[PDB]
Structures are given as C-alpha cells and as structure tokens.
Design a protein around this ligand. Sequence first.
Ligand SMILES: [K+]
Ligand SMILES: [K+]
Ligand SMILES: [K+]
Ligand SMILES: [K+]
Ligand SMILES: [K+]
Ligand SMILES: [K+]
Lengths: 186, 186, 186, 167, 167, 186, 186, 186, 186, 186
Amino acid sequence: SLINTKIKPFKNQAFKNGEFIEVTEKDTEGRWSVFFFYPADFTFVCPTELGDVADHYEELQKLGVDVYSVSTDTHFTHKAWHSSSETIAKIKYAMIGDPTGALTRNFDNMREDEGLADRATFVVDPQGIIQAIEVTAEGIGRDASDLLRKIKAAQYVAAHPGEVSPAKWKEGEATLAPSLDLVGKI
Amino acid sequence: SLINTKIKPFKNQAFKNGEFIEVTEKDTEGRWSVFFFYPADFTFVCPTELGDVADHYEELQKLGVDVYSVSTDTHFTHKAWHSSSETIAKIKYAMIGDPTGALTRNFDNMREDEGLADRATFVVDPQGIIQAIEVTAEGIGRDASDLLRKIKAAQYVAAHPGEVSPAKWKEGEATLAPSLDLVGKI
Amino acid sequence: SLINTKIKPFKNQAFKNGEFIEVTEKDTEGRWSVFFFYPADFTFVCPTELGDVADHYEELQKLGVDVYSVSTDTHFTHKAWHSSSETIAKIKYAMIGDPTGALTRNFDNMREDEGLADRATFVVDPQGIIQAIEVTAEGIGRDASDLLRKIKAAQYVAAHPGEVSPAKWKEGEATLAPSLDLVGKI
Amino acid sequence: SLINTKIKPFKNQAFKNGEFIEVTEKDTEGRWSVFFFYPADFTFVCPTELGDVADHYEELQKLGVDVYSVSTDTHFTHKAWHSSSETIAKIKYAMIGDPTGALTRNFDNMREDEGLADRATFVVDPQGIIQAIEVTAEGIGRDASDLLRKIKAAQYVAAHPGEVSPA
Amino acid sequence: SLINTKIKPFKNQAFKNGEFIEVTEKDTEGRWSVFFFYPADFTFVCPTELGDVADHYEELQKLGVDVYSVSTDTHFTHKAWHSSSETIAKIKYAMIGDPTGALTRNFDNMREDEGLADRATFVVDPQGIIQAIEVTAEGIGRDASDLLRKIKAAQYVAAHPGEVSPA
Amino acid sequence: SLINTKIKPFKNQAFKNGEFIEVTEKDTEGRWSVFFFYPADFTFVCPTELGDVADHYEELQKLGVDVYSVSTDTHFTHKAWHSSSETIAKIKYAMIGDPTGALTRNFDNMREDEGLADRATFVVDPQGIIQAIEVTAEGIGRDASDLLRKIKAAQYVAAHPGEVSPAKWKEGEATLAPSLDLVGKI
Amino acid sequence: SLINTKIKPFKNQAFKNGEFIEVTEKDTEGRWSVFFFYPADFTFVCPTELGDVADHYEELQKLGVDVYSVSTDTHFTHKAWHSSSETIAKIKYAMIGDPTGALTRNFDNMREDEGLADRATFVVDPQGIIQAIEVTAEGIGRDASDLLRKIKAAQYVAAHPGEVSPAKWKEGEATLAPSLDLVGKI
Amino acid sequence: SLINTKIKPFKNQAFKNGEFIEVTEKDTEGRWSVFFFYPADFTFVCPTELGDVADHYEELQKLGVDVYSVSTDTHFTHKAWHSSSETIAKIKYAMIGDPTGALTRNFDNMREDEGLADRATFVVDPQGIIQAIEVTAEGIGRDASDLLRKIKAAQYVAAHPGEVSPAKWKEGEATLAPSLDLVGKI
Amino acid sequence: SLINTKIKPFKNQAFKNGEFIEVTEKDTEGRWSVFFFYPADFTFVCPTELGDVADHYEELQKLGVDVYSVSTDTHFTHKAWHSSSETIAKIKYAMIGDPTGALTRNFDNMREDEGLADRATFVVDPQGIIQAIEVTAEGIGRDASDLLRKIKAAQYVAAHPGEVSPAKWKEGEATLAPSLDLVGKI
Amino acid sequence: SLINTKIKPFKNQAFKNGEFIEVTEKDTEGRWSVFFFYPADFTFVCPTELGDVADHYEELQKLGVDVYSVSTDTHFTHKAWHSSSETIAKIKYAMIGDPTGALTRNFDNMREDEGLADRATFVVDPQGIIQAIEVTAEGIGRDASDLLRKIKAAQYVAAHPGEVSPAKWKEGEATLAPSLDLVGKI
Ligand SMILES: [K+]
Ligand SMILES: [K+]
Ligand SMILES: [K+]
Ligand SMILES: [K+]
Ligand SMILES: [K+]
Ligand SMILES: [K+]
C-alpha cells in the first residue's frame, strides 16, 4: 500500500526541452509532482496519454505542479521519440529514463516479466507524500482531466486542514468540516 | 503491485438490501466486480462516494458488474448506517464487513496504524484479475463516472483483444490497434 | 492468566458524554478501573449489561472507580449507537473504540477469527494491577452488582493489608487474620 | 482467554467421600462441571469458598452439575484436610490433587513463582466447552450464588438458543 | 552427578518447632547440612525415614550438622502433618516446603511425571560442597546410621586430608 | 537423577578371573547388577572399597547379583593391578575398562575435566532399572554391607509388590501395606 | 569465465527486416551464432559497430552463421532506430530487445548500475557451446573480420577434431596435431 | 563481466630473462598491462601464442605496456620451458607462475575441473582498470596485433576524454565526439 | 588423523615410461601402494628422493607394491622433467599430475598457501587402508630404506594376524603374539 | 595437516624419573621436543619402541631434545608400568598421562572408536612448529634411529636456512642449495 508514504530517493537521466538533465528526489522537494509511468517509447496508447497531460501542462505549472513521465527506456530514446512523434513533440516536462528500473521499483510499479513499468500515475505533495494513486491494465487509458481534479482536491485539502473535498469535488463547492455534529447524519 | 493479479479467496458477512448474507470469491467468479473500500461507517466524506456509486448502480448491473463496498466495520454497523442515513439508504449493492481485516489485507489496503481500510477502488474481471486500481488520500473523493469509463473500457479490451482503447476514451470513439507498422507514428 | 499482572500501555479514541476524547494508560494511574469488553455495537441483543453498569456508574464514581467499555468498533460507531439506543444513551462513562485490536490483545481478549473481543471484565487497581477477571459466553449475564461487590472487596484489602476477605464478604462482616494459631481447624 | 474452548485431557487422583478415585476428562462428558481452583490446603483462611460450594452442592447436583475442587497439593493432603477441619468435612464433591500442575496449566491458572493455583472458577458444559470464567486476587471472595446464577443461565441459553431481549 | 559441586541458591518457607521460617543457602554457610528429600507428606508409609533422622538429630547437632527435610508440599502442610502424627511430631529440624519445585530441581531430584521428589539424601559441607549422595527407589530404605557414618568420615577427611591407608 | 531409569546399551572389554571378556547390556538382562565406579587403577590409596565388595561377592552371587567394577583405565591395566596388589587380587568379578568413557557417561558419572569416573555405585534390577544410587567424595567410604542391605530390600519389594520397606528393614521385620486406613496418624 | 559453456535458454522479441519475431535458444540449435551486445540504441559508438557487422553479414550467412544483436531497449525501439539511421538501416539480421535483462545476464554481460549491456561479442557453436568471447570498454570499438577470423578457425577445429589451430592462421596455412612428443618441441 | 573493473591484489613468483622476481599489483600501477593466460607449459598451442607476443614485445614496451604471461605451473617450470623450447626461449617478458590459482581466479579465468587457466587476454590501464577482454576455446589461437590495435585505441581514449573510438580505426583516421545531437544521426 | 582410513576415489593423468596413462583408485585395489607426494617438478631435494625410490623399485615390484609420485604439476611437466633430469629419467613408476589438487587434498596434504603438496609418504594396503604415514618439513629428506622396512612390516602383519612386528623390525626376527600371558611383563 | 603448524597449549601430569610433575607447552618453548604417542601401558609392542628411544636419550639430550611419551593412561599407570617392566624402567624422559584426551586431540591423534592414541611421533622445534610427523598402524614399529636422523636434519636446516639436506642424509655429507641456476639439473 503506497498511499500516504514518502517517496524514496532516486537519481535518473531525463530528456526535457532539448536537453539532457539529471533529476533526483531533491528536485521534487517542496513541489507538487506527478509521476507518470508508462511501459514503452515508440508504442501507441502511451503517446495520447502523454500528449493529453502535455495539453494540461500549462495549467499544472501555474498550480505549482511538476510532471515526470517515466519508462524503463533510456533518456536517449526519449529524445528520439520526441523528435519523431508530433504528439510527443509537444511535451515540455521531464521525460525520465529508468533503464535500471530503480525508480519504477521504488513505486512498486514494475511488470517483472516484461521489464516495463505498468500504467501508473502517482500524485506526490511538497512533503514527498503520495496523495493519490491510479494504475490501469495495458488496454485502459487514463484521463488527464480527472488527474487535474484530484490535484486540485489534494491542494485544497493541504490548504484547509480540518476541511475535506467530497465525492465529485470540483472548483468552488461546499466542502465538509469534520466534527462531532456531522457524524452519522449525512 | 496488485495490477493484473488474481484476487485471493475470502469469506465475509455482508448487509445487502435488508438482509445478512455471506460473500466469497466464488460469488465473483464469471462476473465483473468492483471492490470499493472506505475507512469507516458513520463518518463524513464516505457516504457521498458510496451514494454516487449507488446512483450508477442499475447501469453497472446492466453491464454485469457487481458492487461490493468494504470497511473494517461489522455488517451490523452497515445495517445500522443504512437505516440512519438517507444517502446510505440508497445502497442496493452488498456492504461487506471486514472486522478481521482479511479482505482488506488481501487487497493490501490496510492502514495498519489505524485498523481501517484506505480509500481504494478495485476493478476485477470475470477471471478474477484486477484490471484497474485507484487509491486516494483521506481528503480526496473518487468519482463514480470515471469509474464507469474504466469499466466500459476494460470490458471493451476483454471483448476486442488485439485493439486497445487510449485515454479519455468513451463509447463510440476510435481505437488503436497494436501492430508492427504503426510503431512510432502518432 | 493475567490475574495480578500490570496493565499494558495503550492509546485509544473514545466517545464520552457527547465528546471525543483520547484515553491512555496514564488516565488510569492512581484510579480504580473497570475495563468492560464486549463484541459489537448495534447487534440485535439489548445491551443490558452496559446499561446495568450505567445504572451503577454514579456509585462507582463515588468509590473512585472509572469505567471504560471497549469493543473493536470505532468511537464514531459508539457515538451513533449512543444516539440510537435508549439503553446506550444512559452511558456517561468512556466508550473506547479499538479498531486495531491492540487494547483487546493487551488483555488477551480477542477472538482472532472474528476480529471481536470476548465478553470479559477486568478490575484494575491504582497501581495498574488486575485484581479480578470475569469472562462469560453469550447469553450468560455479567451482573453489575457482583462487579460492585468485588470492587468493594478489592478496595477493602487495599486499605487493610494483613486482613483478607473470604468468599461472602460484604461490608460489616468478619474478616480473616494472618495467624499461625490457625490451621486444618477452620 | 480460554472462554469458549474445549477443556484439555487430564488424569488426576482425587479424594471423594472417604475414598481415592481417578478423575479424567472422560468423567466430564455429558455433564455440567465446575472446576473450582484454590492455592493451598491447610491454610490461613477460613476456607469458606469451598464450604460455600458445599452448601450449594445438593442444589448443583439437582441441576446435574458436578463439582471439582483443584489445588497443587496431593490427594493425600486433601484427605488429611477433610479429616481435620469441620468446614472441609462438609465437602462431598471430588477434591482433585494436581502436584504436577498439569491440570492447572490446562486452565492457564498457575502462579508460576509460587507453584500454586490462582483463585479461578470455570464452568464447563456437557461438550467440554468453557462457558464462564472467574479469577480473583487473594483478598476478593468468589460468591457461590452468583455461580448458580451463571450456571442456570448457561443451561437456559443452551436449551433455548435465540431467546434474548431485543433492543 | 552433582557430587563435589556447590549447592545453588534457594529461598523456601519451612516449618520448624512450631514456627514458620525462611531458609536460604546463606543459612547453610559454615555449617554441615543434610538435605533429606521425600515424595509426600501425609502418606501411606510409616514415615520412619524422618523419624529415624529425628532419633539421631541430637547427635547430628553435636557434630554441628543441620538437617533439612524437603518435599514439594507446602510448609502449611508440614505444620499440619507435624500436628497429627506422633512420628512426625518428634521432628525438630526444619521441614522445607518446595511447591515450585525449585529446590528439588537444584538437586536434580524431581520425578517430573509426578511432581514429587525422589528419595534422595545429600551431605553438604560448610563451603556448600556436596560430599555424598544417596538415592533410592520407593521400597528401599535409607539407613540413618550409615548417614552418620558418612558424615563423620566427611568431617574427618576434611580435618585431616592425606590420611588414608596405603596399598 | 537417573533413579528409576533403564540402563543404556554398552559394549566393553573386561578383566575377569584371569581372562579378557566382553561385557554388554545383554549380559545384565535378567540379572541383578551392581555397577561399581571408581576413578583410577594403581593410585596411592588402598582399594579397600573394591576389596570389601570382593569379600561379599560369594554372597552376592548367591542372591543372583552380578558385580562390575568400572574405571576409565584399560582392561589391560586392570589385569596388571590385579597381579600387583593383594587386595585387588581378591577380585573375581568383572573389571570393566572404559577408556572411551561411554559407559561412565551413560551413568552420567564422568569428571569431564579429569577424564575419570566419580565414586558412584548403581544397583540395577533384572529389567534394567536403576533401583539405588550412591556417590561419595574421596575419603568417604562406600560400605559393602550397606550395599547388601539395599539389594536385599530391592529384591524383597520386587518379590512382594503391594508391600514397601521403610527405612530400617532387614529380613524379619514388619512391612508396610497399601491402605487408605492409614494417614497423618502413623 | 563462460568460455566453453552451453548457452542458457531465453525468449526474446526481436526486429528483423521489418517484421517482429520471437527468438529462442531453439532457433540457434544446429547453427553457429554470434551474439553482439551493445549498451544503447540512438547512441554514437554502437551503429558503427553494428554496421561494420552488417557489411560482413552475407559472408557470415554463407558460413551458416546467424547474427543476433542485443541491447536492453525494446524491439519496438530497434524498429524505430532502423528507420531513422542510414547506418542502422543496413542491418538485415535480428535485433533482439532485452528489456528484462535476462539474456544479458545469461551471458554475464550486465552493467548492473546502468541497466545496459557491455560491448561483448560471443561465438556459439551448433551445439550451443561458447567458443569465443570479446569485451571492450565503452570507448573501444570492435573489429568485424577479427570475428570472421575467429569463426572460421572455430569451425575448422570442430570439423577437424584432434587438431588445434595456432596463432594468426588465415585460410590455407598449417595446423598442429596434439599428443605425446611434439611436447615441449615447438 | 569484469570489463571496467579494477584488478585485485596479487603476489606471484615469476621467471623473466633468467632471474626470479616477485610480481605484485603494485608493479602494474602507472603502467599499461597485458595479462596473457594459458593452460599449460610444455604443451602445443601455447608457445605459438606466447612467441607471437614476444615478436611484438618491444613495440609494446615503447608504448609503456608491460606483458605478463600466466599459467598455473610454477615459476620453476617456466624457467625450464624457457631453456628447452626455442620458441619459449625468445620471451623476455615476465612469466608468472600461479600454482595457488589465485591470480587466475581474480580474473575469473579458471577451468575449475582442470586446474588450468583459459585462453584469456586482459588489457589493464595505468589505474588498474580492465579495458579489454578476450577468451578463446582450447583450439582457437589469439592474434598479437589485434591486441596492439586494441591497446593503442584504449590509450587514445584515455588521453583524449570526451571522445570515443569507433570500429576498425588504425592510427591516423577519424573519431566520434559524444553528446546531444549526433544522436541517432550517424 | 588419516591413519587406518580407506583412500578416497580419484582420477588423474600420469606419465609412466613414455606414455600418458590414467590412474584411478581402481588401479590400487588389491595392490599395495605407495603415494609419494612432493612439492614441485624441476626443484632439488625432490629428485634425489624420487630417484632413491626408483633405486628400490625393482624390489618393491617383486613384493607386489606399486608406486605413485604426486605433485600439483601437470603430467605434461612430468614428461619434460623425465627427459631433462638423468635422476628422474630412471623412474619407471607412475608420475601423477594433480593440478586440481584433488588427490593431494584427499590425503589432506596441501600447502594451501603455496598450492603445492607437502613432503608426505603414504603406504596403502590392498583393501585401501592407509597403514603408514610420514610427513616432513621442506628441508628434511625421507629415507627409502626405512620405507622398505615399513612395507615389509605392514605386509607381515597382514599375513600374520594375531602377530606383530616390534621396534626395529627387520627380515626374519622374533615377532610378538598378543596374549593374556604377555601383558605387562616385557 | 599439522605439518609446519604450531602446537597448541596443554597442561598434563607426568611421571618422570620417579616423580610426578606437570608439563605444559611452556616447558617446550625454546627446546626441541619429541612427542611420542602410543596406545596403551601394559601391552606388548609399545615398550620396544619406548625402550629404543630411551636408548637414544642422552644423545637426544646432548642435542637439546626433550622427549615426551604420551598415552591416554594416567601418570599413576605410567609409574606402575615403570616399576614392573625392565624395559620401561630404562625411561628417563617424561611419561605424560592424557586421560582427558586433550593432548592427543591437539595432535589430531585419537582413535575415537577406542579412547587410545595412534602410534604417532611428532618433532617440534623451539618455536613450537611441527617439523616431522610419523604415524604407523598398530603392528608396525617405529625406529628411533631414523627419528634421530630427521631431528639432526631438522636442526641443520634451522641452523643453515638457505640450504636443504636431501634424502638419507646424515652428518658430514653434501647439501643442496636452492637457487635459480640449479633448477632442473640433478
Ligand atoms: K530499456
Ligand atoms: K472493526
Ligand atoms: K503443593
Ligand atoms: K505437592
Ligand atoms: K601446477
Ligand atoms: K584412560
């Protein structure tokens, strides 16, 4: 159960906007982060999901949220994919390579018989605590707008302790304030 | 992780539509199942998620999908809750009590600290295989619509093996077909 | 058995007279205590046993005895029961929730295959020593006035070391006295 | 606790009404039993817990309940006690000797630093199941009328499962 | 065997001449001791091993030898026995109770299946060393004059090492 | 202690009346036996104890008692001692050599830091059960006539089960008899 | 070292001249095989090495020698590289993808800290026995006919048992015939 | 594999041009080293291999490269071989004897069943790092200037960091300069 | 203590009268054997000892005694030594090579820090039982005439069980016949 | 093996020239020592070996050599034996008793089967190092002359480090000097 645990240290090469950079956990400290795992560069279902997040990246950045896509491919491969796919071309966040699989396994997200990461998305808060987890089968695409929903929910809860965001929570809704009075009445 | 793994045997008591029944893994064989974990009866956030799922329930039933809500409370407490809340009153799917924690630990979903289940939703296919997982922090509500989307998508890949449905996919829109030729092009 | 051993440290949430409080072993130090275990809130039997203790609680408090009921349900569930049942509504002592089972296991009183406590009562003195234990099967009532009797006896021996109370003692009766003057004769 | 578990096998010598007999768990089958433990024969207290049970023994026998007192003394010592104290002389139930401590540990009722049993009473139904347990410190008396009350309830729920007061 | 080893520490309650006392290994320091074990108070035999020691107790005291009888019964039970049997009533040495069995196991003298001590006698010198051991089955009597003979020899070799008969 | 346990199998060389023989536990079956241990051949003390047994050997043989002396010296050394010492020359019973120490350790009678047996005597009945043990320190003599006494007592109880011999018994005296007629009175 | 050992079983996906195939150890039986490992697709040193081999590939096929290149990238990635590099484009032999790293570890050829295979070349006979091994540092390129030189020599030895081939021999020059007294003579 | 690892310490006796010397890892520091392993003195294939190296030995010395041949025979035996074979006689580099097999196991080069080293050649840089490895079967001879080719290439890379040397390069031809976008370009 | 134990199986190559043969324990069965260990071919002290035995070999053979010299050198090396030393040249018995050290270690005779056998001589009877052992320091030569003495002693004892050969035993001397009569008189 | 190893500490009682003394490893420091093991006092073969050593004893003493005979018998038995045998009577070196077997097991020389030492002779130098070992079967006598030869040889190598004395060597004859040049020539 990795929900509500702190992410483990890591150090990986990544491709980001035409450069190779190093990313470590220190980059994520004090920031909101999305770790977006996918199985394989040059595949199919994967780009539309990565592109979709890219579509939301301007808004994520305005909200102080960084994004890291991760596969067991090399950063070298990411750079190539980025130049040959016009969907991937629009990605401006870090594409992390994890050929040792270390980062994938920190998140218990390896397909051990394929040596590829599972389709998993992790939301990590500025204290390194995992606040949301999504994992789907090889054939089921994720939904970046729902990802946005959860991040805003997580950010809200962080900013209003003692308050919570209910089912269907969206921008500006009545929230709940835990209390002795509210128990069993809803 | 538990993605793409088969669920483990269990035998639990439940409240369902005014009666106490036993539920086991055998009751799930050949059915789609959703296992919907939450931390505690009589709290605040929980009903809204549970009511929303109930709102989608005939539609889920029309899709051959069974719903099981699960907490570490007893079936007695579920029955009581069902009487005192207009929201919980709306529930016609089984409310499983897991006071030993065995069912919860089968899904690796226990807060050992607290003796309560985390907010996790699991989709399980007729072969017992977990096809989607969602876990969120205490303050972040799930969304039963996105749940349906994944289920519809899961059934689709089950029903159309060599094709996959990419992100945000809903009924009637275009699929991708993994093959050699398509490698690297979107 | 645990007779004449010291209670172990514990930390639990409780419902007590309309508020949530924390109880620890520090709350028992210097006080007499009754730990009153039972299997489950909201079952179908009338919670007569708990009501009987409530009936005697003013008197117990005058003897400086604190009462704690304990089950593996949450303090949230205790609050609900207390609103819904006329018998339970009489309770002004602390109702401890023990969903982790730690307090119940400290007193070796768990039904491990059910996740519920057995019907056991423990009398604990101000130094934390267990001075009396009672456990009964379902349907065999724990009598609150026998509880009072044992407590008054325990307080008496504490105040009068060198004297012991045989079977039969109630206030005003003869005591027995260390002697060498004494045996195979009585 | 041992509540709702089956008693373990045992074989002990006992004193009963002027003779020595052997008692085993086979003697408990089909019967209600009370196992009444205490620390020591020939001791400083008015043995009024045992006298109290004796006083109620006729009534217990009418309910088809057998009584066994148990301590870690020998059956030899029980016989001597029974023939020196007017209170013990009233006892007509079996006085089991448990010098190995085996029976006592079966009921998890040993004071290991003393080699004596704690003041525990156990009610056992005809299938060998423990339906009630009571343990007290040395200054706190076991009440025989409360025992009777509990035995009659145990027999009642046994013959009429299901009849308890709703909420 | 435990021959020529130092006795282990112990703390037991005893009956001695109408009072209860505590006995420990500190009580044996500087003294000769006989530890006389037996299985059970209030038993079927003429307790003539103990009576025999009593008969020789004055003489043993003149040799500066203390005697301790030991069984797994309580000191309580020893007191009762001493006040019911004319043979036991003759005993003026300490009757140690060993209900935990600790003292008995120190002398490796327990019948584990019975919870009773075997018929063993041990001679212990002023430095706590065991100089003689005797153990017998239940039908085979321990002779007190042979004990005296062995104690006087042990004291003699202790005061005069080196004087034994050549070959 | 080893009282009332069965002797263990053994196989040793012995010197007996001018010949070397083998002794095993099979030689003791159906016979009464004395195992007479001592530390060392050819020491400076007179082997009075062994001579005393030799003095009583004709009588012991009439009671059907076999005698075995045992030390950790060889049977070769026993032969030499027997030629050189007038006391030892009287011996017509078997002198077992135990250089491996196995027979001595079977009777738990080894001084492990010296490699020599302690001064111990064991009486063993025809079923191989040890009925009496005597161990003394150096200089404290084992009396052969006390040995005879214990043997006659052991044979008596064997022939008269239901009777036991108190301390004091020699042939012709009263016996004690199982009774219930009997105690705290004698 | 692994010289003169049998290769271990494996199952890998591969790219070859526009099709995806499964390669297993069974496909190498009764054939000579060259396993050509490299760290990473889309790099710099690697293509020059692979292309060098491709130049010689027909001559290798006439000798009944199959070539397998291997990296820890996926077969998907090989296909992409094959279409993007004019140098990689000339490869007509199988490019095996080894994302689990199993095939690489079988040949003990993993940089465990990096998740990439070392620059190693292995010659494997029709019976699966490794007959030649080469490994170079990241900066040192291999030489394609040194390989050829070693293969023909390996093949001649197999077909002419009882003879061994000395240093530097090229086709048509003399060999040594092992035994009794050439010893120490050459 | 051992490529790119530091050599382990060793201490061996050796024969060199009529003297016995002790060689240790200290003697290789700040020098380039070739370790030339072979199974057995007085054989057949071995001298042709060693003599081939001897032919090139001066050219190796001008490059500051020391040569060490190694077998599990003693240094005594090397001296004997050196005086009996005209081919071995031309060796002026150190012939190390490795009768314990330790040096051979350090390079993981033992035939454990035979007690002989395999036909392996190791190139070691001044910092002790193995930069090149070759192993051939019993019947396949090595090639002395392939070695030379690899050494100069190894040396050029060391003295010109940030550059790597592609396949087949001989003195005077062009090298590659690693980074950002030559990627996938050659 | 290997005296009086059976030799362990082995299989080694050996040089004997111009041929290479295989020797195993089966060769030694039913024969007397001498295993003559020495540290190293081409050394100094060793030849005179081996030559010395060679001087006695005709007589050893007449007595049905085979000889095996053993070192950790190869059989190849033995052949060479045999051709270059006129002392070794006169050896007509098997010279066993033990480069794995297996034979040396069967006899617990390895100098583990040198990988050479110690100076040990073992006499083995037709049942494989070791009847005599000699081992000396590096500087102390053995004496083949004493070896002859012992073999004849061993053969005698084998042929006359119940009889023994005393100190100084030589051809035709009074022997000793163990008996009860002889004990302690000599 | 124990060749060239240091002897272990011991503390034993002994008979020497009419008195009982203690012997430890400290008594051997700085002296040459011979440890002469035999199985049993009062037997047959043993005295002849022991008497012969005594015959050489002043000469051994003149060489600074101490003799210790050792059996698992006591010092008492040694003293007795010394009185009854004219051969043992001749002994003026220490006769150590080892009834615990510790001294014997230090030299790994126990027949565990029997509790007796094997016929072993050990030569130990002033530094505690074992320089020669001889072990023979029950029926094969040692020869004190060959013993002297080894000792004289051992002292020689001690006194002349770079030279060794070869087989059959006795005083005044030629030595060999290990050096480079001599390798392979005798
Ligand atoms: K990869
Ligand atoms: K619960
Ligand atoms: K007792
Ligand atoms: K007792
Ligand atoms: K060698
Ligand atoms: K011995």
